[PDB]
Amino acid sequence: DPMASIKLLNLERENSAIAQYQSNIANLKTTLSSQETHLDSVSESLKSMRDIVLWGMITELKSYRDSIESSFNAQDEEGHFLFSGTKTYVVEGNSDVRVVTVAKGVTMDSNMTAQEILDIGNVLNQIDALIAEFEKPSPNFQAEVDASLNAIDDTMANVLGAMTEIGGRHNNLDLMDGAHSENKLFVDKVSGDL
Amino acid sequence: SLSDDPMASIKLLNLERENSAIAQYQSNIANLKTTLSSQETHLDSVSESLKSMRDIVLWGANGSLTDQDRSGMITELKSYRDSIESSFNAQDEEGHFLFSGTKTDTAALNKSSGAYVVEGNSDVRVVTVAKGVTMDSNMTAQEILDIGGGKNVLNQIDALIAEFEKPSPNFQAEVDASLNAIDDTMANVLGAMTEIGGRHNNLDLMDGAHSENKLFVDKVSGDL
Ligand SMILES: [Mg+2]
């Protein structure tokens, strides 16, 4: 049935396109989960730094300061920077998005950015200014502590927001992933009926 | 008043802002569905015209002359030909060309030169339909009319009309090029509409998730 032969050829192709989109989804889920991880370490490093600044050590601050710097300038498999924007204390990269085609005509943004997350108006040298007044208190010392606490509070709001946003992306990925899965079994059915 | 419970106040205000974002996405999605259905109507009509044009070629491929009778066929071919030009040059209510890619004030098809030339480009526009998610919202005449060659169906139909007026030894060959060009365009037109139906479905998935989301939001906002 020369026409059934074609009907099949087309179902194979279509099938192959679905396998491709889900491959793009899995890959993108990996990267998202992978940022979620590093944001989780930013946040914990932030809470710890906030404890130090609240209960009161001098060594303890800069440990977390390096634990947050590392995370924002961290690199994947090959060696690209994740939170750099498209340029894969002064802010390293830009705020522009990387996109991925998860379905025909549907594209999804892949990255949170250091520029967006550290933009509180950097917590990183706001803490350099405070570890200073820690080493020898000045009459401004008190005001430094407060906008230190404020900078931690603001970055923490951005960090948490970013993690919320990643999650909404996982939900939306999963939506498309499941539609692909329903669609593929249909294709396996119809293929097998011919 | 707002000062009465201040951390609940902020909570409510952020649920309002999240509620307003969702209502905006769902408004983008309803609007995109509207624009997509609108393209489907024009494509549906392009496909009816391709059908009638093929039926005429099918009869008119004459083993048995009737050469003067073919003068009425010629007019009806030219009708479906023009009607297909009109559909690909459809405009919206603002006056934008639906099928021109990003050249929105330029007609997708132009015949000024003596032949049909595609002046639309094949760029996609996008619409944001959830945080960080875009859906492609246009089809293009330039992708749809491409059957290779660069050499679309409207030119081929004119080569057939010439062959209908003064047959040559190549009559049966233009006929066969004409059915092949029609079959190919039809596949593209139909592939487009299938692609639009898949867009509709994927929108509907996003919209459903936005609807759930709005539930949780109304509930948590209610109990407050
Ligand atoms: Mg305009």
Side-chain angles (χ1 to χ4, degrees), chain A residues 1-57 59-135 137-194, chain B residues 1-10 12-64 66-224:
Chain A
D1 180 358
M3 257 294 322
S5 218
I6 240 78
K7 189 62 186 180
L8 197 98
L9 285 189
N10 291 326
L11 292 177
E12 258 158 31
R13 178 144 175 189
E14 182 182 333
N15 211 179
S16 168
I18 294 152
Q20 228 150 72
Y21 295 126
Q22 309 195 246
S23 185
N24 293 348
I25 289 161
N27 277 350
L28 166 47
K29 287 179 80 50
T30 300
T31 330
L32 293 171
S33 263
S34 189
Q35 298 160 57
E36 196 143 45
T37 284
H38 295 311
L39 290 176
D40 206 279
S41 164
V42 168
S43 87
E44 234 103 50
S45 277
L46 284 156
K47 153 86 161 99
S48 277
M49 218 159 95
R50 197 174 183 276
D51 281 336
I52 297 160
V53 177
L54 289 174
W55 173 228
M57 255 192 77
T59 170
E60 281 275 56
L61 280 190
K62 49 107 268 187
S63 177
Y64 298 120
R65 155 159 147 279
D66 310 340
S67 213
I68 100 94
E69 194 226 354
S70 56
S71 305
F72 282 135
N73 290 141
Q75 299 163 229
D76 63 345
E77 289 295 308
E78 294 178 313
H80 294 32
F81 299 90
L82 277 47
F83 302 100
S84 254
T86 40
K87 273 139 214 315
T88 69
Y89 284 107
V90 47
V91 166
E92 211 205 4
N94 58 358
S95 150
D96 305 271
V97 332
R98 266 137 21 198
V99 309
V100 169
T101 312
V102 303
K104 189 18 182 152
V106 184
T107 105
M108 290 198 188
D109 297 352
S110 37
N111 60 329
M112 309 313 297
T113 75
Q115 187 171 53
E116 264 163 8
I117 310 166
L118 294 157
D119 195 347
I120 67 207
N122 329 143
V123 69
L124 264 194
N125 40 45
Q126 173 66 230
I127 200 211
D128 263 349
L130 183 87
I131 184 153
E133 225 136 345
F134 253 43
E135 287 175 327
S138 323
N140 202 27
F141 163 105
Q142 194 48 45
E144 263 276 299
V145 117
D146 275 288
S148 209
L149 291 158
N150 296 310
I152 296 169
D153 292 1
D154 290 320
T155 313
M156 173 76 87
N158 297 352
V159 170
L160 289 180
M163 275 154 72
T164 287
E165 178 176 326
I166 296 177
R169 279 215 254 302
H170 278 299
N171 301 334
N172 271 325
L173 288 172
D174 295 345
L175 274 157
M176 302 282 93
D177 194 62
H180 277 314
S181 277
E182 295 190 353
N183 186 219
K184 195 231 161 198
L185 295 151
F186 185 100
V187 159
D188 286 349
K189 219 281 157 62
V190 178
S191 290
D193 287 358
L194 281 67
Chain B
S1 158
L2 278 154
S3 44
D4 295 343
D5 185 356
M7 264 271 76
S9 257
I10 317 296
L12 200 98
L13 290 155
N14 282 298
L15 302 162
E16 262 166 19
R17 166 181 204 157
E18 184 181 347
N19 216 319
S20 153
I22 308 177
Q24 203 197 129
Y25 293 131
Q26 299 196 274
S27 169
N28 286 357
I29 303 186
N31 292 326
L32 175 50
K33 294 198 63 136
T34 288
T35 293
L36 290 178
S37 298
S38 190
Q39 289 165 223
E40 254 165 308
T41 290
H42 299 291
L43 295 171
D44 197 55
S45 164
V46 171
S47 81
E48 274 154 315
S49 298
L50 284 167
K51 187 63 215 326
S52 318
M53 173 175 295
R54 204 195 184 247
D55 285 350
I56 288 160
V57 174
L58 290 174
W59 199 299
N62 265 277
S64 323
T66 189
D67 31 79
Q68 225 313 67
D69 200 306
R70 288 207 212 97
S71 138
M73 272 170 223
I74 280 162
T75 306
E76 285 267 63
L77 284 170
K78 282 174 188 175
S79 249
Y80 298 115
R81 183 201 72 188
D82 293 350
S83 159
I84 280 149
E85 166 173 62
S86 270
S87 300
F88 276 110
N89 276 347
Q91 294 168 272
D92 59 36
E93 329 81 65
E94 334 163 71
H96 297 136
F97 292 94
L98 254 34
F99 288 117
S100 285
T102 46
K103 301 187 176 192
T104 44
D105 301 292
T106 127
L109 275 159
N110 200 323
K111 212 207 184 155
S112 279
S113 71
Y116 299 96
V117 156
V118 177
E119 265 149 15
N121 68 32
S122 75
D123 282 12
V124 296
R125 280 99 107 236
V126 308
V127 153
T128 294
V129 300
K131 193 47 157 107
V133 181
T134 71
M135 155 84 47
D136 299 339
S137 65
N138 67 318
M139 292 306 296
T140 76
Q142 178 152 280
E143 170 184 340
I144 295 164
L145 285 186
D146 164 325
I147 43 162
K151 46 164 76 198
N152 66 65
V153 69
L154 295 184
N155 289 330
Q156 174 61 47
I157 196 49
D158 274 353
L160 178 75
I161 291 173
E163 200 59 51
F164 275 20
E165 280 170 57
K166 182 162 196 179
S168 81
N170 251 260
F171 186 89
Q172 208 55 49
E174 286 286 20
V175 162
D176 289 299
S178 309
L179 296 165
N180 299 335
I182 297 171
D183 297 348
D184 292 338
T185 305
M186 177 78 79
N188 284 353
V189 163
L190 286 185
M193 280 171 92
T194 291
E195 199 198 320
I196 278 147
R199 280 176 201 173
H200 279 308
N201 295 337
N202 273 326
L203 292 175
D204 289 354
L205 285 159
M206 301 287 194
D207 199 71
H210 280 324
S211 276
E212 315 216 339
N213 244 96
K214 215 183 71 47
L215 245 168
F216 304 117
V217 182
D218 292 326
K219 181 227 158 132
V220 179
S221 143
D223 300 341
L224 197 47

